[PDB]
Design a protein around this ligand. Structure first.
Ligand code: ZN
Lengths: 141, 53, 65, 167, 71, 83
RNA sequence: UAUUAAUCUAGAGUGUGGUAGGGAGUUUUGGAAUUUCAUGUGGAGCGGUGAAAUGCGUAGAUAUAUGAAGGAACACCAGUGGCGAAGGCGAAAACUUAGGCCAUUACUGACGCUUAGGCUUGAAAGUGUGGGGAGCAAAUAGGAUUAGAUACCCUAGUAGUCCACACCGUAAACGAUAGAUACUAGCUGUCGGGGCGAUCCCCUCGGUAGUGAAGUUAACACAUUAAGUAUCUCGCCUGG
């Protein structure tokens, strides 16, 4: 509420979200802002339910024109972030598609990859549980 | 550059008039490129920055 | 002390303050620099333009008092 | 657009033939009238122009279409009694917005700032004092609401205190 | 460990225990040094000259403390 | 020298629609018409030639965009002599 | 993701107000300075080099004053400045004309980035035709130093440097850093717009600089105008 600042979205949703997280992690920032998109909303939801970041609130103006989402990153009392390294595999013009049997494992399962097969964004381990493959969004560990 | 009243107080000021006339005239007696013209002009401008402030 | 900015002169034409412009002119009919005039960058350009334009009209000398 | 012109005449000649030259030059302009003819009288030249050492400085203040200059410009050079033909046009460096014209307040207050007729002239124009009305009139707001209220959390601090205790 | 009078220009990543006090001014450095000296002194049974002692005290002789700005 | 206010009233569709595609291309055509005369007057005004090329390219791009959404939209806009 | 049918404005444009700038072309105008010539003043040197000599000079030079003609460039203003996409742009005026910044309760409604091929511009040198030629100066001649000097120095000296129409399309055409976008400490200046308002200073949005951490780099170093975190596109590299 009352953000008193103009914010715009960079480019394709996957790349825009990751860069903000990485820069905030490197600069020890805690709060960031970006324009909202249902793909980005879903990936932020699965990220927070995988325990990598704090509160996200999706915000709408006093109209049905613009929707934005702001999300806080998980930290510690000793000021060490939970996010270690983010890398997107999907890329504009380099759409990557692996079957279920070739589903990657990020750092021997320690990390989390976003794989939106048929039911929205959906974690790799529950993907193996449902044995369905598809789009590979990004590696997060 | 006319200025003189009795003997010497104007001569002491003549030295300043001449030095600067000499400095400005010394760059109209040898020819060098326009780029070098600007480069030496900026170099001279740095010199004033260092001392006169 | 750019007294143009201090007063908010806001405009310079030839014959309304020509006596004021003569103060900016050095005794040897030469346009004085910032260190003597005290004008700001914007006004100094205006002063230079006005003095040169007056030089076209022979109101001020060139190489003598 | 506004126009201004300065005339140089043949010096030692009197004033009534100068007015006659003015009237002659009035018709030399195109179909653009509504101009004043206030003049600056006789002033001594700063340097000789062709042979004269003085002349009269004259002025026009008309405004109209761009055709006003060609004929006057070509007839000024040929005439033996015209010396200079400066043509001022609106393209001068200026700005006269109605909201910035009322800076006469700067004039009046600067008059006080220069009032130093007494011995106690401790005032110096180049001296900051930091007064300010500080009418902000600028916030640039952007209202927002809430749509998703995912798992909340509280705040904390990052005060560092290492090793806790010696022994 | 190290404790420092971490004024607003230092780098807190180095100093372990941060004490954001003023040290350029004379009145504050002597005051906090005296509290620390009495803190280590009371552990030695010794009396505390400037610390825990209450009011109408802690008044330190002052090469006067004024004029914070430096050039 | 452009009569910018007048040319709006010609291709304008509503009371206060000044940024429509039709008025933009009308203004671009007027700019091209003026600048062609300016260029033939002064054959060596290179920056003006670059501006002319930029304006004609923008006009072509806007026309191409208009031809993509709806074919029938510019049936009445081809009243201006193009192609 | 791709197609199609639609809606919205935040991307990008158009209009309104504010506004800066050596942005460009065409046509006129001006003063210094040099040269040549004319008129006097005057009598023996001038010129140039580390030193001298070719050269100029009693058929009167250098010097000095006045005047005319002629061509080229526009001191001072001029700066850790302004503009342009790059090359570049600085005496004054007129006409035509390009782009940029700030605020927008206005409008179209994804119309946007990049760009193989293509098109346009593109320092100086050079070339074709017609003019112009004051100064300067490749080639060339002569006087010096050197063993030699076809070089550095000196005295003459044409093409050219100037203008009108074309051609040539190369440079260390350099920020040795392709364009577009989002994010990432801070400090010191300076320039423009805006609000406040005597300047100075308050701050907002922009352009141009210095210092400077995480970060990057082989190091130098870059560091919010990136050589940082990432994406899109083009061009290019694969030992000498
Ligand atoms: Zn000023």
């Amino acid at each position: 509420i009352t953000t008193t600042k103009p914010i715009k979205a960079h480019f394709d949703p996957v790349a825009d979200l990751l860069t903000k997280i990485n820069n905030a992690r490197k600069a020890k920032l805690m709060t960031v802002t970006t324009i909202a998109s249902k793909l980005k909303i879903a990936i932020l939801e699965i990220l927070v339910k995988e325990g990598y970041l704090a509160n996200f609130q999706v915000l709408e103006n006093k109209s049905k024109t613009k929707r934005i989402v702001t999300f806080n990153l998980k930290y510690t009392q000793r000021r060490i972030p939970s996010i270690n390294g983010v890398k997107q595999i999907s890329k504009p013009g380099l759409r990557i598609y692996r079957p279920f049997e070739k589903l990657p494992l990020v750092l021997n399962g320690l990390g989390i990859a976003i794989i939106s097969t048929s039911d929205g964004v959906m974690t790799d381990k529950v993907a193996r549980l449902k044995k369905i493959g598809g789009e590979i969004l990004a590696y997060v560990w | 550059e006319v200025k003189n009243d009795d003997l010497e107080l104007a001569l002491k000021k003549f030295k300043r008039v001449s030095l600067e006339i000499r400095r400005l005239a010394q760059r109209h007696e040898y020819h060098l490129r326009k780029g070098m013209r600007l480069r030496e002009k900026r170099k001279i401008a740095q010199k004033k920055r260092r001392k006169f402030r | 002390y750019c007294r143009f900015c201090a007063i908010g002169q806001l405009r310079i034409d030839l014959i309304d303050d020509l006596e004021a412009l003569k103060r900016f002119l050095s005794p040897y009919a030469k346009i004085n620099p910032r260190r003597i005039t005290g004008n700001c960058q914007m006004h100094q350009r205006h002063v230079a333009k006005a003095l040169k334009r007056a030089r076209y009209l022979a109101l001020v000398p060139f190489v003598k008092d | 657009m506004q126009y201004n012109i300065i005339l140089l005449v043949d010096g030692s000649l009197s004033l009534e033939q100068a007015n006659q030259v003015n009237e002659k030059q009035q018709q030399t302009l195109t179909n653009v009238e509504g101009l004043q003819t206030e003049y600056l009288g006789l002033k001594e030249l700063a340097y000789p122009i062709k042979k004269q050492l003085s002349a009269h400085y004259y002025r026009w203040k008309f405004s109209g279409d761009n055709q006003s200059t060609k004929d006057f410009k070509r007839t000024a050079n040929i005439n033996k009694q015209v010396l200079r033909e400066l043509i001022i046009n609106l393209e001068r460096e200026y700005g006269y917005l109605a909201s910035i014209n009322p800076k006469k307040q700067q004039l009046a207050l600067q008059k006080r700032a220069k009032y130093d007729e007494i011995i106690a002239r401790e005032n110096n124009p180049e001296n900051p004092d930091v007064p300010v009305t500080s009418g902000l009139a600028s916030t640039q707001p952007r209202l927002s609401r809430t749509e998703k209220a995912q798992k909340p959390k509280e705040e904390l601090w990052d005060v560092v205190q290492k090793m806790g205790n010696f022994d | 460990p190290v404790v420092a009078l971490c004024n607003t220009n230092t780098n807190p990543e180095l100093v372990d225990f941060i004490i954001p006090a003023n040290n350029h001014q004379p009145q504050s450095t002597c005051l906090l040094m005296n509290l620390l000296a009495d803190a280590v002194a009371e552990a030695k049974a010794m009396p505390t000259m400037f610390a825990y002692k209450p009011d109408e005290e802690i008044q330190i002789e002052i090469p006067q403390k004024q004029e914070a700005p430096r050039q | 020298q452009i009569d910018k206010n007048g040319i709006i009233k010609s291709a304008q569709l509503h009371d206060k629609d000044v940024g429509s595609i039709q008025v933009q291309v009308s203004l671009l055509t007027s700019q091209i018409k003026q600048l062609t005369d300016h260029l033939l007057a002064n054959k060596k005004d290179f920056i003006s030639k670059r501006g002319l090329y930029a304006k004609v390219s923008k006009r072509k791009r806007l026309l191409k965009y208009l031809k993509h959404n709806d074919l029938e939209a510019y049936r009445n806009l081809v009243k201006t002599l193009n192609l």
